[PDB]
Nucleic acid binder design. Sequence first.
RNA 1: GAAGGGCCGCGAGCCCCCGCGCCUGGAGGAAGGAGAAGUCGUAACAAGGUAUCCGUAGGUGAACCUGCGGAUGGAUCCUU
RNA 2: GUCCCGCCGGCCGCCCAGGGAAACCGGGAGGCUCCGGGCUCUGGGGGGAGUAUGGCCGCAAGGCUGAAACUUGAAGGCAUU
RNA 3: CAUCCGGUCGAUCCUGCCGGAGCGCGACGCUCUCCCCAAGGACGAAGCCAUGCAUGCCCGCUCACCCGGGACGCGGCGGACGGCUCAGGACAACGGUUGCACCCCCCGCGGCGGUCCCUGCUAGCCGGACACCGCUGGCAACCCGGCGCCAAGACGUGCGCGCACGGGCGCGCGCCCCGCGGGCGAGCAGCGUGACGCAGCGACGGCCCGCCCGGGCUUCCGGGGCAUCACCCGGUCGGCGCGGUCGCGGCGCGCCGAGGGCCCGACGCCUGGCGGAGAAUCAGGGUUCGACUCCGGAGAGCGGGCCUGCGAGACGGCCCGCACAUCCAAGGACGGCAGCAGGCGCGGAACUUGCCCAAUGCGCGGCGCGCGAGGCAGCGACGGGGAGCGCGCGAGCGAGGCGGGCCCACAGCCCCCGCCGCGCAGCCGAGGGCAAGGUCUGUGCCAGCAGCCGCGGUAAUUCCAGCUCGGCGAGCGUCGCGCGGCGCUGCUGCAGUUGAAACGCCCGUAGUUGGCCCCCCGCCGCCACGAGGAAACGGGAGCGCUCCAGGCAGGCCCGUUGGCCC
RNA 4: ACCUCGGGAAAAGGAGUGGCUCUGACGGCCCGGGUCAGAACUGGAACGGACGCGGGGAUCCCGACUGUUUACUAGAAAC
Lengths: 139, 77, 176, 260, 173
Amino acid sequence: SKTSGLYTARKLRTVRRVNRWADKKYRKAHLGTWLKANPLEGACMARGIVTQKIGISAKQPNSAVRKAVRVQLTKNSKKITAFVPRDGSITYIDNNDEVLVAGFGRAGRAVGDIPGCRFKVIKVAGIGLLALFLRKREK
Amino acid sequence: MQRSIIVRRDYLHFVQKYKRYERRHKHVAAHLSPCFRVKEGDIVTIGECRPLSKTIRFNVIKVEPVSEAAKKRFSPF
Amino acid sequence: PRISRHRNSSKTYSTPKKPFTKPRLDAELKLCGEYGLKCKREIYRARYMLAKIRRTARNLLTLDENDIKRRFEGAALLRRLHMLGILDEEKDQLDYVLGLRIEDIFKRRLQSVIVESKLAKSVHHARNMIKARHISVGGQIVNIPSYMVRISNTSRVAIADTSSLAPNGKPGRTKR
Amino acid sequence: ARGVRKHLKRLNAPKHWLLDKMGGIWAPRPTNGPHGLRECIPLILILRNRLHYANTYAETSMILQDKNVLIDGKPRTDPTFPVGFMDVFEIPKVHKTFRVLYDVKGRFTLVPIQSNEAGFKLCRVQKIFLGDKGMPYLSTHDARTIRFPHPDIKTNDTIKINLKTGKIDEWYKFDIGKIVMVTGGRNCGRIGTIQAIDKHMGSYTMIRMKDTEGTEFLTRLCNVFVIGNDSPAVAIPTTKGIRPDIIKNRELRLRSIAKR
Amino acid sequence: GITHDKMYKRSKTGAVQGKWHKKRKYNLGRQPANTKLIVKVTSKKNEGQKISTIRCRGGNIKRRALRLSHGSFAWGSADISHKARILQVVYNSTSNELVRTNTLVKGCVVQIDSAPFKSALSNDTLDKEILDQIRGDHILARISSRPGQVGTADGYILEGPELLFYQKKLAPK
RNA sequence: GAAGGGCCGCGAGCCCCCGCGCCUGGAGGAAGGAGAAGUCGUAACAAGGUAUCCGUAGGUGAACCUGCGGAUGGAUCCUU
RNA sequence: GUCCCGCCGGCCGCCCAGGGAAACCGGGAGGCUCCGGGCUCUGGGGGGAGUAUGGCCGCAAGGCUGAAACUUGAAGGCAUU
RNA sequence: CAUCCGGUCGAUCCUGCCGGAGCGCGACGCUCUCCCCAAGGACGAAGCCAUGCAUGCCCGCUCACCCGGGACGCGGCGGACGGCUCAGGACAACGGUUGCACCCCCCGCGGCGGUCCCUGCUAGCCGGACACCGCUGGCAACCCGGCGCCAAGACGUGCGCGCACGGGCGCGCGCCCCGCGGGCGAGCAGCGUGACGCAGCGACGGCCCGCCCGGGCUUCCGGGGCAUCACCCGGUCGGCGCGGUCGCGGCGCGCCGAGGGCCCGACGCCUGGCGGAGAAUCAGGGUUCGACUCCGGAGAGCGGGCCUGCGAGACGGCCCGCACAUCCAAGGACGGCAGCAGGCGCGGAACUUGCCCAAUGCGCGGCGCGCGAGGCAGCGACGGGGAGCGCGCGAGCGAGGCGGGCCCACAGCCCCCGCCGCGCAGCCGAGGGCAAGGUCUGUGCCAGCAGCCGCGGUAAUUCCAGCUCGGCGAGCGUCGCGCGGCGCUGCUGCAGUUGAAACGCCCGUAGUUGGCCCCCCGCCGCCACGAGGAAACGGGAGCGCUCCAGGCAGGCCCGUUGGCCC
RNA sequence: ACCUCGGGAAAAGGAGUGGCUCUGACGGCCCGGGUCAGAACUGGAACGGACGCGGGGAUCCCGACUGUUUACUAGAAAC
């Protein structure tokens, strides 16, 4: 291929513009359909009040009951299911507590054995969840 | 048009990323004086003038005739 | 808007491409003991300075010899390097500028200069002495170990008469 | 939008003015008068920067309010009064008088003059126009307007103003060979004889002039101000617009810094 | 709010052009002046010719005429000029609806009283056709001044091919 | 010459039908993806016990079967 | 003598070089990481899905164009045992 | 200023993505010994705002119980600058390049200066008259009524040089063309002459006239995404005649034609669209962002409409609708923080109801006043920069603490001195990728960890803890995104037999691409070098801010510098 | 909307309309037509001023349709 001629710049510019869309990466980054789909709605973190709590069976092969709180974001009233990091840290979370939830880490993809869960709890009731696990602060 | 011509002027625009160029054409309205008689394809030396109408800011200053059929031929003179 | 908003600022250091590499870590630790370097950030600032210089010479050298550019800037770069003592004053060629290493820049650091002058026992002792404001770069007290001495200023460096030695004789431990 | 702008930002101000970037968030707003902002320099800047006679703007106003300085022989109290080429800045109380000319690097320069030189200032006629019943008028670069000029004087022909009677003294017409000093652009600050004038009918007459270094500079008629015929006429700066090059100026800078 | 900017108008292609600004007092246009004539002096004498004055950008004032009566009219090939009252307006290129109202506009062909121009008829053989018009008390003249932009209506007595053309159009009425 | 009126311009607001973009309620259908262990067969991969597969048309609990024309990516580079 | 030897245009087999991840191509899939003769078309991990919806075309069957939300750490090629 | 490395398998080579490795720049967590520089309610709320504050100065004209204070008003000048934000707007703004023979302009500067009359002139200098003010009042508040005296560089009137002269009008060169000038590349000015008109200054002789600075438009070239947007427009496109404007123009209106735009993407639509100078990342090529410091644009809740002025379609002006407030004695009154602080809402996210014009500018004044422009402090791990937590085996420092200088609108900080003097580390990891136990506990596919490979089901190199160790460092970790990696967007520089991918075939226009040939000229690109126009920024000359991020410095000095490139 | 692309459709949903006074268009060779535009101006806020002269939309079931039918109780989905 590679049409090359001294006066063929327009054909090449059009091909790059049309072809660049094919990659999932350009589309997810620029089509912006994802922005509307994103519960986080283009934010690193979102503040939501816990509406439900549950245990999600870990994807086989790994087996455990991962502890999560279903939270509706205050910003868009959009449901999110968020993993609670650390050991036995769901005890820190209480229903209706209000949490700040940040991305799990794969830019909108479920991470690890947890199935179809893209978010994690970083703060509970104004106190960092890691700090609660590390005993830096109490309740 | 009535005592007016839409002069087409050709030109090249260079893109640096692909060192190739893009032939770009523009249309400009010009007043044709009755003293001159032009057929489509002729070369006309338009000279800038007072905004004479909505689209006419140029006025033919000289005409050199061309043949009936010699091909469209991109010319950026 | 304010005047402060107009002021420039710069990152003078280059962090590594891979930060857990075995060769880089070994050389860094060897350099750290050698020059009494506080953190790898001080070593990074040294690499940056050498890379700027190496690129500047590189560009002038790709330009043909006797091209106005090398005459105006190549002479300036060599002058500056010879005057800071990084470059030997006999070499005096742009091609030689490329063959410099960060260690040589670190050599002109006052803490290394004090140790070769012997005004202190060790590179550790040189850092502590310069911190205590004991060192003078020549009619000027210097508190910063980082100070890179100019080749001419090396002879002028001496322990300032006002200090631990040749002085009141009573500061710190002596007072009590 | 709306009306005129009465404020100037420091980085917007012309580069030749050499004002400090961190010195202020505002610059003097030059007023209208005989020179325009691009081709002027405020009176406060000459007194505060080069002369250093007044420590602050306030001191410059106090001196000006007392009519300490007289430009063109007239005491002017404008801190922002525009000052440009051939303007005679004479401060009598300090006992020192100089002309304001152009340095080779393009910054305005104070060049000392004798009492005869102080009396007159050169001018350039932009064009001769008919107004007010048909009387001809000539408009100098310093915007000085002279009714009924002698017929021979033409556009772009340097003339000399008495400045005591404020009349035309003599005319050095613009022609091939006559010595000129560039006033604007890359060659600003350079005195050279005219090798040739290219007519370029339609727009931009472009003139080529060459100094005694064998180097020809090509500059359009707008910033070419005649300074005497083959003779340089009015006293010219010590560099004499000889075009020192970057490498040569590098050596000169190093000699100056050799001194401590 | 009458404005002469092209922001509210379409492009060459006929594309709608988005408005990026609000009205500007630099782009405003004032309402048109209908410069009527004091034709029916019987009941119009109660209003002497009135010329208004409107301040413009720059503070320069444009005198604008509301009602007019007489202006300088000149027979060029005779060099006879007199101030003549305008009897009636006939034949306008823009619209003949204006002619009915008598509103004066630059380029309207008017009729003027020949009594000021009487001396020229006695002067021997001035032209030919224009003399007949002087013999009859009505002379055709084009208003050559813009009423409402200077507040005056001066003009020229029609002569040459122009006079014939205007007369030919006005022949049946 | 003040209110006031007439008349046109310039022009908010308001209602009226009309398009448009977007958001979503929903008996009933109807996909897809995972749950884990179900249920019924066994279509394909070994000639997978009828070689597969492509188009197209008909049938069938379900994979699928069948007609007709292909292909070999076949199980054949091999026969007056 | 439908002999011998060519030439030109085809239809083929085998291959030296070269190439390729190989299987193999070699009249190219060579002359290409030492990369640029010209010109059109298409592709950009696997599903979702050639589905939804919009357009057009068809008597229909359908054709042509053509997603996204979402899911997932593999799918694939050619060879070896 | 050129790099990779784990994961498809019994193994292996590929393609291919997945995940790591670097830098940003915002959030979030944990923590913080000093000093310097420095961002800070932009991020789909251009949502709403309580309070205080951001615009005055003058002394022209003083019959206000100090004085010649300079109340108050009247006048004058500025309030149109500046600050603030990014909603609007996609052949637009904007950037470079032209033009105005199509224009408008205050100040300033330098010029120029004459103003018909008849009357009515008083010219040794003319009238009246309004506040302020005094009294008499009405107001819930807002707010103003009436009466009487009195002034201006205010007002009204007018002395005035028929080459007196504002506007507009009529006329006044040609002979194929182009070759002096008042002045052009250009028939452009100016004026001569007649008719009109009698406009401006003329009551402490300014109208006018240039130049400037600003504006208005104008040429050219650049100026998003989408084809599930292919036809689009109908004052649309031209011509004429007017009006209107500062002017030009469909700008508007008549009149007449049928144009105009479009695969070199028109028109539509959408934009969580201000644009540039620039910024992030960076072998070369590139990609993404540009609210924000400078410049231009646009808007002050939303639409409109105006007045004043030389310039505003002005909102710290007015008027109206429209939502949204406050007061109220119920009749009315009245706003507009996308100015500064500060408050609420919202969001992941963002500072003091400080202090002051001393600078730097600006407005106004001649003997300085105003300014939330700006400067000064507080807040502040946005970040950038520099020194610490010892060295030595005995001597020291600075972190502090206190005075005195220095500094400052006043403090303070810095720095300098005396006198005391008390060093103080986190955050993530150790199976790999990836640097650092195959330790010792608990636990038993649970609880957890793990970006990815995976780990745990009794001997967990992986969890939870002590233990050591490793990285980085007053910082370190996490998240979202940009860029790099990714020659996985490819112009350099990808791939299409079988991994994803040659239209089933032929014709075919637009588009793109074309063998060899003439030397010596004309246009086009083309290359070089100019000129012209913004600095900041980025380079880059010089200069020891004690080093450094910095800044334009400095020192008896090229007319000390502050070059130059872009 | 829908459609057998013919229809739906006069869809729906609006605005105008009188009298007077004019001004354009249009032929033949100064002579005819009286229709179509465009104005002013006027009237208790009126004009197809009598008369003539569809209400409209959304569906569902039958019968494709125009036709024909029990003179004199069914005009239909029946024929």
